[PDB]
Structures are given as C-alpha cells and as structure tokens.
Amino acid sequence: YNVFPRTLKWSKMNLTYRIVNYTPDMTHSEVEKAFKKAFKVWSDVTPLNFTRLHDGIADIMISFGIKEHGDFYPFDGPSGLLAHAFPPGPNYGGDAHFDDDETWTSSSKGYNLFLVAAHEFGHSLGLDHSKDPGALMFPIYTYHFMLPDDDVQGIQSLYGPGDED
Amino acid sequence: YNVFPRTLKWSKMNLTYRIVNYTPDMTHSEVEKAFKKAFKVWSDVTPLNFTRLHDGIADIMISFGIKEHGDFYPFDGPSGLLAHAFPPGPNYGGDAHFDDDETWTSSSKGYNLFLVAAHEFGHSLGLDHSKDPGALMFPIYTYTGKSHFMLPDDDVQGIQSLYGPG
Numbered sequence: 001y002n003v004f005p006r007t008l009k010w011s012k013m014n015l016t017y018r019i020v021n022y023t024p025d026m027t028h029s030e031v032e033k034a035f036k037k038a039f040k041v042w043s044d045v046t047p048l049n050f051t052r053l054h055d056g057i058a059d060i061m062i063s064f065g066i067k068e069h070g071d072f073y074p075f076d077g078p079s080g081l082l083a084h085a086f087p088p089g090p091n092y093g094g095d096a097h098f099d100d101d102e103t104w105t106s107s108s109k110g111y112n113l114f115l116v117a118a119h120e121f122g123h124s125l126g127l128d129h130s131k132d133p134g135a136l137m138f139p140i141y142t143y144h145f146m147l148p149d150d151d152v153q154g155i156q157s158l159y160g161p162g163d164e165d
Numbered sequence: 166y167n168v169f170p171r172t173l174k175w176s177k178m179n180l181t182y183r184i185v186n187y188t189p190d191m192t193h194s195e196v197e198k199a200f201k202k203a204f205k206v207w208s209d210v211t212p213l214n215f216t217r218l219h220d221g222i223a224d225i226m227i228s229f230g231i232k233e234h235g236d237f238y239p240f241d242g243p244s245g246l247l248a249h250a251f252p253p254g255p256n257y258g259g260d261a262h263f264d265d266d267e268t269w270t271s272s273s274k275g276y277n278l279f280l281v282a283a284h285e286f287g288h289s290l291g292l293d294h295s296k297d298p299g300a301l302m303f304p305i306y307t308y309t310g311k312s313h314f315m316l317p318d319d320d321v322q323g324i325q326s327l328y329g330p331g
C-alpha cells in the first residue's frame with residue numbers, strides 16, 4: 001500500500017518545463033536565459049534536474065497571459081497580481097503563469113523576469129511564502145543573486161541537498 | 166519558510182457525504198446502494214463512520230460530471246480517466262467526481278460503480294495507489310463476477326495504518 005506524501009512535492013528528481021509562449025517585452029533568448037537561470041537557483045542546492053521540452057506535456061508549463069487565461073486566478077491588468085504558480089501535482093500543478101500586462105525585463109526596470117520566475121518556481125516546487133524579509137519567497141518583490149538561507153533550508157526540507165560540494 | 170502541508174488523514178472519525186447529482190445509467194436507489202456499500206468497505210475495518218447528508222456541505226461531496234466540470238482537471242469522454250478523488254482536507258478535499266461519459270453499472274456492462282467508488286473513497290481517506298497487483302487501490306479496474314467483494318489485505322493494512330482497526 002501507499003499513503004499520500006506529507007507535503008506537496010514532486011516524487012521524482014527529473015522535472016521538465018516548457019515555455020509555451022513568449023512575452024512581447026524581451027527576446028526569446030533573454031526569456032530562455034532568465035528561466036534557465038531561475039531553475040538553476042533551485043537545482044544548485046537540491047538533487048533536482050530540469051530539462052526543457054519544446055512542445056508536448058512538461059511538468060512545469062510556463063506561459064504569458066492576461067486577464068482570464070484558463071484557471072481560477074485571472075490576471076488583473078497592469079500592476080497588482082504579477083504572476084502565479086501552482087504547487088506540485090498533476091496537470092496545472094507546477095505550472096507558472098506571468099501577467100503580460102506587466103513589463104518584464106532583463107534589467108532593474110519593470111519586473112525582472114529572472115527574479116520573479118525564481119520565486120514562481122519556488123511555488124512550483126512546493127514552497128509557499130516566507131516571513132523572512134530577505135528570502136526569495138518573501139511575498140513582496142524588491143529588485144549577483146545568491147539564494148538566501150531561508151529558501152535553501154525550505155527547498156532542502158523537501159528534496160534534500162543533492163551534492164553538497 | 167513554509168511548505169504546502171498535506172492533511173495525512175481525517176482528524177475526526179465521523180465523516181459525512183452528499184450525493185450531489187446522479188448518473189443517467191442507474192436508478193437513484195442503485196447509486197445510493199453502490200456508494201453506501203463502497204463506504205462500508207472502509208468503515209468495516211476502521212473506526213470511521215459515514216453519514217449521508219441531503220443538503221449543504223458534507224466532507225465527501227460526490228458528483229457526476231463530464232469534460233471540464235469545475236476543477237480544471239477535466240474528464241476526457243468515454244474510457245481513459247474514469248473518476249478522481251481528492252485526499253483528505255478542507256473544501257475539495259475528500260470529494261469524488263465520476264466521469265459521466267462512462268457507462269456506470271450495478272453489474273458488469275460498463276464500469277461497476279461500487280468498485281470504482283470504493284477505490285475513489287480510498288483516495289478520499291488518504292490512500293494512494295498500491296503496487297500490490299491484487300489490491301483495490303491497484304489502479305486497474307477488473308471485475309471478478311462474484312456477488313461478494315472482499316477487501317484485500319493490502320488495503321486493510323493501508324487504511325488501518327492511518328486510522329487503526331475497528
């Protein structure tokens with residue numbers, strides 16, 4: 001027999017993502033680089049592996065959308081809700097959606113896609129918000145990056161550290 | 166930090182259920198009897214008790230639906246996905262949905278509702294799929310043709326690991 005796990009977490013280390021569509025605001029390459037770096041934040045401190053699929057069904061489906069976009073969390077135009085992502089699970093679980101009524105950037109202007117994506121992917125992997133104001137998973141955005149201790153502790157609580165050196 | 170913690174089991178032994186709507190394929194009485202028997206599979210081997218509510222919110226809300234039916238886990242027409250149920254927890258937790266593009270039956274012409282429901286309610290109570298090929302919670306539907314059903318030992322052991330014996 002098997003009972004359910006104690007926390008929402010992926011029951012496998014090999015995860016896939018797919019960039020289903022792209023923002024007007026940045027080039028394809030910039031978007032791909034930001035998402036790759038954002039996944040690496042998490043793979044660097046766990047045993048998780050992330051592989052990009054160009055089509056088909058990936059664990060973490062990533063998309064840019066506005067207003068109603070096919071779930072219970074419609075976007076709301078400029079500002080306000082910026083993005084959201086679902087906890088680990090089937091179907092919409094793990095998926096990450098970015099409001100394309102925001103301005104996404106590879107800079108300090110607008111909202112930095114890498115930083116927001118890293119936080120989203122924390123949700124995708126099973127972290128909720130943190131009360132540590134210095135954490136990546138703190139619920140409020142403020143603009144090299146090094147994953148804060150609180151987030152390391154949280155993600156390792158789910159998946160272990162992988163190779164520690 | 167915070168994670169998303171799962172409710173590993175119901176923290177009360179007395180649970181309610183509600184049959185929200187009914188399949189075309191069976192009479193109301195047949196549906197009621199199938200679900201009552203499916204809950205009895207589990208209450209017979211634990212301290213869990215199940216009571217039916219006719220109105221309002223119940224712990225285990227049961228419904229029949231097709232395609233996209235309100236939870237963004239859509240059904241898929243005949244065959245494939247037959248039903249799904251959510252683990253213990255508030256709101257949709259415990260609830261069970263049956264794909265009404267299947268043919269549900271009290272016997273063998275289609276999918277026996279009692280058998281599938283008993284499996285669903287395993288999920289509702291905190292059991293995932295078993296690897297024991299003879300288990301109720303082993304995820305392949307089969308039909309013995311026998312008039313009596315005995316809960317396999319793997320499932321007894323699994324549910325008692327959560328709730329203890331009767």
Ligand SMILES: O=CN(O)[C@@H](CCc1ncc(F)cn1)CS(=O)(=O)N1CCN(c2ncc(OCC(F)(F)F)cn2)CC1
Nearest residue numbers: 081082083084085115116119123135136138139140141142
């Ligand atoms: O994730 C998304 N939200 O929290 C939504 C709420 C929807 C939701 N809630 C819970 C859940 F599990 C899933 N979705 C609110 S928001 O305004 O769109 N949100 C604010 C916080 N954001 C952020 N990003 C980077 C960052 O780096 C901090 C650092 F720079 F220090 F690293 C700090 N916050 C991202 C965008």
Ligand SMILES: O=CN(O)[C@@H](CCc1ncc(F)cn1)CS(=O)(=O)N1CCN(c2ncc(OCC(F)(F)F)cn2)CC1
Nearest residue numbers: 246247248249250280281284288300301303304305306307
């Ligand atoms: O429960 C539902 N599913 O598993 C869905 C997947 C959605 C899902 N996955 C996990 C979870 F926790 C919740 N929901 C798949 S399915 O094809 O619809 N399906 C349901 C009925 N299954 C079955 N197996 C044996 C049996 O008696 C076996 C016996 F006769 F030997 F006793 C009676 N039903 C076969 C598998």
Ligand SMILES: [Ca+2]
Nearest residue numbers: 059091092093
């Ligand atoms: Ca997914």
Ligand SMILES: [Ca+2]
Nearest residue numbers: 077078079081
């Ligand atoms: Ca917005």
Ligand SMILES: [Ca+2]
Nearest residue numbers: 224256257258
């Ligand atoms: Ca419920």
Ligand SMILES: [Ca+2]
Nearest residue numbers: 242243244246
């Ligand atoms: Ca189906």
Ligand code: NA
Nearest residue numbers: 025100102103
């Ligand atoms: Na935009």
Ligand code: NA
Nearest residue numbers: 265266267268
């Ligand atoms: Na039907």
Ligand SMILES: [Zn+2]
Nearest residue numbers: 069071073097
């Ligand atoms: Zn969305």
Ligand SMILES: [Zn+2]
Nearest residue numbers: 119123129139
């Ligand atoms: Zn967040």
Ligand SMILES: [Zn+2]
Nearest residue numbers: 234236238262
């Ligand atoms: Zn459903």
Ligand SMILES: [Zn+2]
Nearest residue numbers: 284288294304
């Ligand atoms: Zn199942």
